[PDB]
Amino acid sequence: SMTDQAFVTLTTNDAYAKGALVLGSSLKQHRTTRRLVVLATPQVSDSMRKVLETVFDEVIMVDVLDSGDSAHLTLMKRPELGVTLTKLHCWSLTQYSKCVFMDADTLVLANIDDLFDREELSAAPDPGWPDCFNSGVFVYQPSVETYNQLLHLASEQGSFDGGDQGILNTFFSSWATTDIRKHLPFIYNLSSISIYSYLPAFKVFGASAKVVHFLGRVKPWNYTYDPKTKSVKSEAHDPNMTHPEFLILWWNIFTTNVLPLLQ
Amino acid sequence: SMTDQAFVTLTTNDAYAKGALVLGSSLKQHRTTRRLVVLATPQVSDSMRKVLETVFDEVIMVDVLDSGDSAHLTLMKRPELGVTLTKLHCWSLTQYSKCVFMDADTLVLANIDDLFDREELSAAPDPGWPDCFNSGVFVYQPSVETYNQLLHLASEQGSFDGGDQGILNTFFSSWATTDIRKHLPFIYNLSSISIYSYLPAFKVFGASAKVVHFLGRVKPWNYTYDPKTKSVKSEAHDPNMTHPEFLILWWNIFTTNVLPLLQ
Ligand SMILES: *[C@H]1O[C@H](CO)[C@@H](O[C@H]2O[C@H](CO)[C@@H](O[C@H]3O[C@H](CO)[C@@H](O[C@H]4O[C@H](CO)[C@@H](O[C@H]5O[C@H](CO)[C@@H](O[C@H]6O[C@H](CO)[C@@H](O)[C@H](O)[C@H]6O)[C@H](O)[C@H]5O)[C@H](O)[C@H]4O)[C@H](O)[C@H]3O)[C@H](O)[C@H]2O)[C@H](O)[C@H]1O
Ligand SMILES: *[C@H]1O[C@H](CO)[C@@H](O[C@H]2O[C@H](CO)[C@@H](O[C@H]3O[C@H](CO)[C@@H](O[C@H]4O[C@H](CO)[C@@H](O[C@H]5O[C@H](CO)[C@@H](O[C@H]6O[C@H](CO)[C@@H](O)[C@H](O)[C@H]6O)[C@H](O)[C@H]5O)[C@H](O)[C@H]4O)[C@H](O)[C@H]3O)[C@H](O)[C@H]2O)[C@H](O)[C@H]1O
Ligand SMILES: O=c1ccn([C@@H]2O[C@H](COP(=O)(O)OP(=O)(O)O)[C@@H](O)[C@H]2O)c(=O)[nH]1
Ligand SMILES: O=c1ccn([C@@H]2O[C@H](COP(=O)(O)OP(=O)(O)O)[C@@H](O)[C@H]2O)c(=O)[nH]1
Ligand SMILES: [Mn+2]
Ligand SMILES: [Mn+2]
């Protein structure tokens, strides 16, 4: 645990870095005994790298990997997600025997160190197509073999969604049909889309939520937050505002724990 | 071939009966060798019951069971779905050893008799909360024991969503974590919402779809269809129109196979 296992996140810029900082802070809040690592690319400013170094045990600099797959990315109206191929570098971290990758738009609500009981590749179902796993939280084993296989697949075939999730689902294609232990409970990767879409289920199961995932184009750091009243401005049709306490928690952690580190 | 196995659907009115008729027509189109059964309630007109007897091998009259659960039904803005507890009568059908229940708003695209290789309770994940199964397609074993247990649970505790899906998930609570063979592939219950929500997945996995499920308040029979050009009128934000060929298939089956028996 102490030395050989890690939580790993990714940021390619200073905007998603705010997410990584909140994520990291939340993992510390719930007393993880594992290492905290962030993959960062050159667009992350030197000053932001130094702040990341105050929350994460290590900031590892990597090259951007970009699908350039405009056709598939436009299908999802997420033209900016080609750089998510950069996530594949997480397999290069052979200093660790086992890691949990978490998207920089996640937030931890409870200690989730029991994820290290799982084996590669363990992930939660994606609400959009639930025979695919969501690649925002997953348990994997760093490996030079797997790393290079994934790079090769990405170069030769690309990804069916132009980002990491398509290629990871294609590589780890047995997930839907083999080994139910590699299905993480949905409470380890609770997309705000699910709360909005089937509120009765959230009402009975949502109290057990361990990780919330602010999946979608609008991210927590794109809201206007008032720390005096603890509210955000919001617009119509916003699944983040079905149970807005997760978004306010994000902002509370940012305002109280991250904002002083930005001084 | 199995004279002791059946597909089973439900209609409490003449509107959903149009759905049942198209479903049963589609099961015949794809050469099922099993029996076709429809549970119908007193609000189904006598003329419609007679038409149902042309498609279905058995039309079984049952009493409406209604949750009356306005609080939970309004959370999903589906105030009409309390009558879905009537589905529980499917477990009374002890003349069959095994059955597949299918919602009246489903449509079969390929032979699915291989579902009878599955054991109770086998179902596909729900896109809204994917640690719940969707109760629109499920493999079950009729049983007086199970029937009465479900009725009793429904009377004492009700359903967390006011309809059958909540209570069925509560009763068959091991589904998410036990026996991956009881996870039907999502292609056996493909919700239109999923096509709309993660189109790249539909583009690579969707050609294999076996069953489409027109889940949501607007049903196929509510569209205005022009048989001359094979088109429907549609409004903004319609997940059914992402891949509208499923809706058009519904209408082509209705127009050619079913409408002439009604009008
Ligand atoms: C829909 O059509 C209109 C939009 O075209 C819509 O109007 C909307 O306007 C708002 C947009 O500004 C919208 O906010 C919503 O934002 C999300 C849309 O971005 C929406 O969630 C939906 O869209 C997401 C995509 O962002 C779908 O996720 C799917 O695709 C993701 C990648 O694009 C997957 O992420 C995964 O893959 C990454 C890349 O490989 C990987 O790096 C990640 O780690 C991994 O998570 C995801 O898995 C996959 O499912 C959602 O499925 C889909 O629900 C939110 O609901 C919402 O916040 C408003 O909702 C809306 O008003 C109009 O209303 C609709 O008819
Ligand atoms: C959201 O806010 C606005 C909604 O008011 C929305 O504006 C919309 O207006 C249109 C409405 O005409 C909308 O069309 C929509 O149609 C679908 C629903 O009507 C919607 O899908 C969403 O809603 C359904 C609810 O019907 C969710 O399903 C969940 O709940 C179901 C039961 O209610 C579950 O069904 C299951 O359970 C039954 C009862 O127990 C059982 O009998 C069944 O057999 C079984 O299937 C289901 O499993 C569960 O998931 C969906 O999850 C959810 O996606 C479409 O997305 C939507 O298109 C227009 O799109 C929109 O303009 C506004 O845009 C949004 O921000
Ligand atoms: O410009 C970007 C886009 C994405 N990411 C990283 O890739 C992940 C996946 O992207 P995102 O969460 O936006 O996808 P979603 O979950 O919304 O589909 C993020 O959480 C970040 O870790 C990044 O660093 N920079
Ligand atoms: O007024 C109704 C409502 C529902 N149903 C039956 O219950 C199923 C579940 O309801 P629906 O499909 O509308 O729910 P959804 O799948 O849209 O959540 C239907 O397919 C029908 O078989 C019915 O017979 N009459
Ligand atoms: Mn994300
Ligand atoms: Mn249905």
UniProtKB/Swiss-Prot annotation, chains A, B:
Binding-site residues for UDP-alpha-D-glucose, renumbered to this chain: 10, 12-13, 16, 78, 87, 103-105, 134-135, 161, 164-165, 216, 219
GO terms, molecular function: glycogenin glucosyltransferase activity; glycosyltransferase activity; manganese ion binding; protein homodimerization activity
Class of enzymatic activity (EC top level): transferase
Top-level taxon in the UniProt lineage: Eukaryota
Posttranslational mods: Self-glycosylated by the transfer of glucose residues from UDP-glucose to itself, forming an alpha-1,4-glycan of around 10 residues attached to Tyr-196. Phosphorylated.
Binding, Mn(2+): D103, D105, H213
Catalysed reactions, as listed in the record: L-tyrosyl-[glycogenin] + UDP-alpha-D-glucose = alpha-D-glucosyl-L-tyrosyl-[glycogenin] + UDP + H(+); [1,4-alpha-D-glucosyl](n)-L-tyrosyl-[glycogenin] + UDP-alpha-D-glucose = [1,4-alpha-D-glucosyl](n+1)-L-tyrosyl-[glycogenin] + UDP + H(+)
Cellular component GO terms, alphabetical: cytoplasm; cytosol; extracellular region; ficolin-1-rich granule lumen; lysosomal lumen; membrane; nucleus; secretory granule lumen
EC number: 2.4.1.186
Pathology linked to this chain's protein: Glycogen storage disease 15: A metabolic disorder resulting in muscle weakness, associated with the glycogen depletion in skeletal muscle, and cardiac arrhythmia, associated with the accumulation of abnormal storage material in the heart. The skeletal muscle shows a marked predominance of slow-twitch, oxidative muscle fibers and mitochondrial proliferation.
Family of the protein in this entry: Belongs to the glycosyltransferase 8 family. Glycogenin subfamily.
Subunit and partners: Part of the GYS1-GYG1 complex, a heterooctamer composed of a tetramer of GYS1 and 2 dimers of GYG1, where each GYS1 protomer binds to one GYG1 subunit (via GYG1 C-terminus); the GYS1 tetramer may dissociate from GYG1 dimers to continue glycogen polymerization on its own. May also form a heterooctamer complex with GYS2 (via GYG1 C-terminus).
Protein name: Glycogenin-1
Originating organism: Homo sapiens
